[PDB]
Every structure is written in C-alpha cells, then in structure tokens.
C-alpha cells in the first residue's frame, strides 16, 4: 500500500506576473519555501516551439537498477537515436502492463513503482539520457540556421532556460570560472520508471525544470527547513550512503519511499508535471521522482539575491563535512564587487551585506593565525590556480581569501581553520598567502554601497 503525499502548490500567473521570472519567484517564495517544490503553469499562449529530427539526435544511455535504499552514483556503452530510444521505451511500458501507453493511469504507475522498488524478487532495469547540450543533442529552447519568427519570439524570454543564468538578477551570472554544471542546462530523456534519487543542488541553489513534451514526470519534495531531519532518517536506514567520498564524482544517492519519511514526521509534497509546465525547487529542498513514460525535460540551476546568505552557510557546512566545492563563494563576491558600477542596484545592496560578514570573519581568522606564530606573508592570486591546486588538505575547501603554505611541503595549502594540519614544522616557517589586504577590501565594499545608494 502507498499513501500519496499531499499536493504541492500550483501557480497560474497572468502575463503581467509571468513577464519577469525573478520578480515572480520572489513573490511566491513565502508559500513555496514551506513545501520545497512548486509547479507553475505559464499563460495559455506562451508556447515555445518544439522541433527536432528524431533520427539525427542521439546520445549514450545510462542504465539503472530500481531497488529501494540501494546506493547509486549521481554522475557516472552503446547509442540510441531519439527515435530508437522512444521505440524501446514505448514497447517496454506497453509490454509491462499489457495496455496501450496513454491508457495506463498515472496513479497506477505510481503505485507500481513503489511496489517494484521494495520487493527483492523483482529485477527491473531501465535506461535514460542525461547531459548538457551539445552538437549531437541541443537545447529544446530556441538558440541563436535561419530562425522562424515564432522561434525568434522566444530567444530572449526570461523563461528560456538558456537565458535564466545570464540575466541581471542571477548572481551565478558572472562567475568567471567556467563551471559547466551550474550555468548550463541539463537535458533529460526519460522512460517509464526511470528515477532521480533524493538530492539537493550543489551550493544549495534553486533549480527550475521544464517538460518540453511527453508523458508526465512525478515529483516528491521536502522544504529546506526539514533537510537535516530527512538526512537523519536516511543515515539510520542507509548508513552506507554517508561514508566520506573521494571525489565529487563519487556522490552516493538512493531511492526511498516518501511514506517512510512521513512516518518519521518529515513533511513531503508531490506533483505530476505535465508537458508545458515548470517545476521550481528552493534552496536546500530535497527532491526525488520518476518518469511515467517517454518524455524530454530541460533544467538549470540558479541563484537569486535571496540565496546569497544561504550560499555562505552551505560552504561552511561543506567544510564541516570535508566535502568539495564547485566554486569559491568568496571569489564570486569579490568578482561582483570589482564590477560594482554595472550591477543591478538591489544586487549591489545584497552583495554589500554578505561582503561585510566576509570581511569581519576574515579579520578574526587572520588575528588567530598570527597568535599561533605565523608571521611571514605574501599576496597570492588564488584565482589563477586550478581548483585541485588550492583545496585545503584537511577539509577540501576551495581557498580564495587566504591560506597557509610551508616550503617543507611544496604546493600544499590549508585554510585558516586548519593551520595545525599542514606539516610538522613550527609555524614561524609558514607563510600567510592572501588575495587582498583589509585596506584593499574596504574600498571594494564602498563601491557597492555607492552603487546601491542611488
Ligand atoms: C532520471 C533522469 C533522466 C533525471 C535526473 C537525473 C539525471 C542524471 C543523474 C541523476 C538524475 N534528474 N532529474 C531531475 C532533477 N533534479 C528532474 N527530472 C530528472 C530526471 O528525469
Ligand atoms: Mn527491484
Ligand atoms: Mn535536482
Ligand atoms: Zn580547511
Ligand atoms: Zn613544513
């Protein structure tokens, strides 16, 4: 038996409300942050054109076992076209139920998914596609052949997910480090029972997902305030998932029945996303789900000004866990401060507040390491090092504001929380390597204040 969670909020914005996605997301946040996920139905005549040759789009499929609480890797040998994948997917579903595909009720697919993942005797395996856009398989939205007027109409829409990162209200917008995972949309080609395991987004970002066409995508979501409650339940039932991971390519995730979370007082919400609808996930909101049949979705991460303090909290949380970072949060803040004259004024005001916290934290850490006997110092342009050359030996954080080095261990660095973890030499042999003096930093913050105060 399966008891479906309550439905998540559904929004139907007018065209006036829809025109600015960031204003709309800010508006619905008091409701939707209490449920973790929400669904958005665009105005009826917002219909971006979907056109592709199913024989020229192709991709390498991933394969997936469907066992509850079994470890799966979040990021991982033949090849499908969009046509031959669809032929396999449709035959799979109609053979599984002995019915035509658009006659299998969504409630029955959901009930059967939770039965099959729970029984050991069933050995069902399925396949799917997942990758960023490429010449072999591009975005489902229009991008800059000669375009039709209809395609040109949607090139610069705020809800064209290619544009979402680069708009003037995103802060991930101007990370200069190429981070393919956080500005570039992912494309998901689904079949019946293919499933995304429970997760949150890197650096606790938002995400937004559009179903271009096909059968529905079923979601489960948990509000950000219950994240640690969910993690405690999973640690108790699946401890193998919580061992320390060697790389960011070795993150373990799993399938888990939402009734198990609800039994343990974790709030969970559900929805069926149909073609032409968006789903939005909020910072630190856990989510999972599965595809009802052959379909095609596109999704991207993004960060608003609301998110900025949560981003700083996330990197602190990563430090406690010795988890790798995708980018340096402080590097992003300082990059924006160096471009204060071109920032949105509301963005400038919010970045200024986070910068003030950063500067006071850095002042206190530098005083502590001076009292430990580190005397020598030198400026160091951390942004020029490859990421894997500026991680703290102990906690793996990506350094940018400062670090400690010692000529006895050439090339190694610790962050200023881990001065005692670098080597056995006494601290007077160490050097403080810093990006900025405090005297460089206060004028940078003042530029943001001037930009914000007009
Ligand atoms: C099942 C898969 C095709 C898939 C995956 C996904 C992809 C690669 C690795 C891990 C998960 N993720 N996903 C989301 C999210 N979040 C929304 N929808 C889907 C989806 O359909
Ligand atoms: Mn199974
Ligand atoms: Mn996700
Ligand atoms: Zn450290
Ligand atoms: Zn040493």
- In the block, tokens 């004024």 appear at 345
Q: What phi and psi values does residue 341 have, to the nearest 5 degrees?
A: -65, -20
SS (H, E, C) 78-127: CCEEHHHHHHHHHHHHHHHHCCCHHHCCHHHHHHHHHHHCCCCCCCCEEE
| CATH classification at residue 262 | 2.60.120.650
* Alpha carbons 315 and 326: distance in angstroms, whole number: 10
Which of 370, 420, 425 has its CA nearest to residue 392? 420
Q: Contact, 422 vs 414, CB < 8 A?
A: yes
* Alpha carbons 123 and 125: distance in angstroms, whole number: 7
Which of 283, 287, 304, 322 has its CA nearest to residue 418? 322
For 23, 24, 85, 372, the CA distances from 304, given in Å and listed in that order, are: 10, 12, 37, 39
Gyration radius (Cα) of the chain, Å: 24
* Alpha carbons 452 and 454: distance in angstroms, whole number: 6
* Alpha carbons 386 and 228: distance in angstroms, whole number: 32
Which of 420, 388, 424, 396 has its CA nearest to residue 408? 424
Nearest ligand to the CA of 325 is 4
Nearest ligand to the CA of 421 is 4
* Alpha carbons 56 and 378: distance in angstroms, whole number: 55
Distance 359 CA to ligand 5 centre (A): 28
- List the 376-379 sheet strands across, edge first: 376-379, 430-434, 402-406
Which of 202, 206, 290, 281 has its CA nearest to residue 249? 202
* Alpha carbons 90 and 100: distance in angstroms, whole number: 9
For the record, the structure tokens of 270 come out as 């559900």
Which of 215, 244, 177, 201 has its CA nearest to residue 94? 215
Instruction: Please give all residues whose CB falls under 5 A of ion ligand 4, grouped by chain where several chains appear.
Output: 392, 394-395, 415, 417-418
Q: What phi and psi values does residue 40 have, to the nearest 5 degrees?
A: -130, 120
3-state helix, strand, coil split of the chain in percent (to 5) is: 40, 20, 40
The alpha carbon of residue 142 and the mean position of all alpha carbons in its chain are separated, in whole angstroms, by 23
Helix, strand, or coil (residue 207)? strand
The residues, ordered by sequence, that sit 6+ positions from 415 with a Cβ below 8 Å of its Cβ are 319, 392, 394, 395, 397, 399, 402, 403, 404
Q: Is 320 exposed, middle or buried (0-12, 13-18, 19+ CB in 10 A)?
A: exposed
Please, which residues bridge with residue 81 across strands?
58
Four-residue CA torsion sign, 271, 273, 278, 280? positive
For the record, the structure tokens of 389 come out as 């050359």
Q: What phi and psi values does residue 403 have, to the nearest 5 degrees?
A: -160, 170
Which of 406, 448, 441, 396 has its CA nearest to residue 427? 406
Ligand 1 neighbours, Cβ below 6 Å, are: 74, 128, 130, 188, 190, 194-196, 209, 217, 291, 297, 299
Which parts of 160-257 are beta strand (E)? 186-190, 195-199, 206-214, 217-221, 252-253
Tell which atom from ligand 1 comes closest to the C-alpha of 195: 1
Instruction: Please give all residues whose CB falls under 5 A of ion ligand 2, grouped by chain where several chains appear.
Output: 66-67, 122
Q: Which of 182, 196, 289 to mutate to test the pocket of ligand 1 (most atoms within 8 A of CB)?
A: 196
Four-residue CA torsion sign, 255, 260, 264, 265? positive
* Alpha carbons 264 and 258: distance in angstroms, whole number: 10
Task: Provide the 8-state DSSP code for 454.
Answer: -
**CA torsion, ordered 66, 70, 76, 77, to nearest 10 deg:** -40
For the record, the structure tokens of 286 come out as 């856990």
* Alpha carbons 345 and 348: distance in angstroms, whole number: 5
Q: Whose CA is nearest to atom 9 of ligand 1?
A: 74
* Alpha carbons 163 and 185: distance in angstroms, whole number: 10
146: left (phi over 0), alpha (psi -120 to 50) or beta: beta
Angle at 74 (CA atoms; ends 70, 76), nearest 5 degrees: 105
Q: Contact, 420 vs 403, CB < 8 A?
A: no
Resolution to one decimal, Å: 1.9
* Alpha carbons 355 and 334: distance in angstroms, whole number: 8
Q: What phi and psi values does residue 364 have, to the nearest 5 degrees?
A: -70, -40
Q: Contact, 196 vs 289, CB < 8 A?
A: yes
Nearest ligand to the CA of 315 is 4
Query: Please, after which residues is the chain broken with C–N above 2.5 Å?
Result: 76, 144
Q: Which of 63, 72, 130 to mutate to test the pocket of ligand 1 (most atoms within 8 A of CB)?
A: 130
Please, which residues bridge with residue 10 across strands?
39
* Alpha carbons 80 and 381: distance in angstroms, whole number: 46
* Alpha carbons 83 and 86: distance in angstroms, whole number: 5
Give long-range contacts, CB 8 A cutoff, 24+ apart: 69-72.
69/237, 69/238, 69/254, 69/255, 69/256, 70/254, 70/255, 71/238, 71/240, 71/241, 71/252, 71/253, 71/254, 72/197, 72/252, 72/253, 72/254, 72/255
Q: Contact, 399 vs 453, CB < 8 A?
A: no
For 16-68, give the DSSP string. Answer: HHHT-HHHHHHHHHHHHTTTSEEEE---TT--------TTT-EEPPEEEE--T
For the record, the structure tokens of 104 come out as 């299998």
For 310, 337, 353, 364, the CA distances from 357, given in Å and listed in that order, are: 13, 14, 7, 11
For 149-175, give the DSSP string. Answer: HHHHHTTT-TTSTTTGGGSTT-SGGG-
* Alpha carbons 226 and 186: distance in angstroms, whole number: 27
Tell which atom from ligand 1 comes closest to the C-alpha of 295: 21
Which of 341, 365, 346 has its CA nearest to residue 444? 341
Distance 104 CA to ligand 2 centre (A): 20
Q: Contact, 289 vs 223, CB < 8 A?
A: no
* Alpha carbons 270 and 113: distance in angstroms, whole number: 15
What is the residue range of 77's domain? 10-310
């Amino acid at each position: 038996m399966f008891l479906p969670p309550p439905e998540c909020p559904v929004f139907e914005p007018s065209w006036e409300e829809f025109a600015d996605p960031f204003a709309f997301i800010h508006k619905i946040r008091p409701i939707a942050e209490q449920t973790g996920i929400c669904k958005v139905r665009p105005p009826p005549d917002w219909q971006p054109p979907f056109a592709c040759d199913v024989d020229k789009l192709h991709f390498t499929p991933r394969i997936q076992r469907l066992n509850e609480l079994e470890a799966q890797t979040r990021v991982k040998a033949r090849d499908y076209t969009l046509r031959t994948f669809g032929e396999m997917a449709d035959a799979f579903k109609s053979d599984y139920f002995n019915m035509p595909v658009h006659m299998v009720p969504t409630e029955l697919v959901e009930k059967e998914f939770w039965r099959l993942v729970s029984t050991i005797e069933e050995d069902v395996t399925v396949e799917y596609g997942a990758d960023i856009a490429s010449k072999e398989f591009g975005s489902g939205f229009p991008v800059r052949i000669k375009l039709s007027p209809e395609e040109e109409e949607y090139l610069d829409s705020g809800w064209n997910l290619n544009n979402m990162p680069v708009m003037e209200q995103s802060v991930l917008a101007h990370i200069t480090a190429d981070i393919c995972g956080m500005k570039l949309p992912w494309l998901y080609v689904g079949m019946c029972f293919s499933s995304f395991c429970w997760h949150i987004e890197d650096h606790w970002s938002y995400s937004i997902n559009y179903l271009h066409w096909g059968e529905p995508k079923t979601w489960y979501g948990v509000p950000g305030y219950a994240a640690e409650q969910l993690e405690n339940v999973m640690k108790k039932l699946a401890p193998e998932l919580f061992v320390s991971q060697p790389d960011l390519l070795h993150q373990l995730v799993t399938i888990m029945n939402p009734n198990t979370l609800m039994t343990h007082e974790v709030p969970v919400y559900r929805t069926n996303q149909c073609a032409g609808e968006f789903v939005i996930t909020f910072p630190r909101a856990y989510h999972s789900g599965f595809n009802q049949g052959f379909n095609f979705a596109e999704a991207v991460n993004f960060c608003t000004v609301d998110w900025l303090p949560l981003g700083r909290q996330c990197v602190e949380h990563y430090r406690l866990l010795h988890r790798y970072c995708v980018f340096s949060h402080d590097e992003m803040i300082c990059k924006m401060a160096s471009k204060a004259d071109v920032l949105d004024v509301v963005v400038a005001s919010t970045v200024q507040k986070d910068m003030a916290i950063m500067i006071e934290d850095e002042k206190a850490l530098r005083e502590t390491v001076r009292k430990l006997g580190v005397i020598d110092s030198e400026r160091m342009d951390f942004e020029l090092l490859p990421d894997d050359e500026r991680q703290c030996v102990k906690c793996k954080t990506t350094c940018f504001m400062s670090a400690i080095s010692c000529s006895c261990k050439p090339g190694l660095l610790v962050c200023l929380h881990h001065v005692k973890e670098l080597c056995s030499c006494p601290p007077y042999k160490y050097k403080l390597r810093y990006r900025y003096t405090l005297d460089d930093l206060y004028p940078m913050m003042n530029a943001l204040k001037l930009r914000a105060e007009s």
